[PDB]
Design a binder for this molecule. Sequence first.
Ligand SMILES: NCCCCCNS(=O)(=O)c1cccc2c(Cl)cccc12
Ligand SMILES: [Ca+2]
Length: 125
Amino acid sequence: MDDIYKAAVEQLTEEQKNEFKAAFDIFVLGAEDGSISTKELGKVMRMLGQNPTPEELQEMIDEVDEDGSGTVDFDEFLVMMVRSMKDDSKGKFKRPTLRRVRISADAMMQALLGARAKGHHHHHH
Ligand SMILES: NCCCCCNS(=O)(=O)c1cccc2c(Cl)cccc12
Ligand SMILES: [Ca+2]
């Protein structure tokens, strides 16, 4: 959990936090810990059209899980979304060998939000 990523979470207004909070609750649907785990990840990813395995699911969480928690909480959840945005938005550093996982974090949110097709006002974009 980098300070920059942490700041990004706090940089979110009440509406922004509320919107993400809703996704978090859904993400951890049935979660005993309340954090996004492999079980929750698999279900969420399944909706996105993915079929990752438990080992793969844990790896994903590990991507945003810097504390070695093993699960993605509210902090990691926002960080994961911010991480992707920060990349295209900035993409500073960029280690060698290139980066993998072209999965769109925004795309996942759309699946999680659902809304019977009409996910939020289309005018918002
Ligand atoms: N531009 C960097 C993209 C990284 C952000 C997304 N990472 S991801 O492995 O594709 C991913 C997608 C959806 C849910 C995830 C969760 Cl819940 C945890 C870790 C990674 C996840
Ligand atoms: Ca954690």
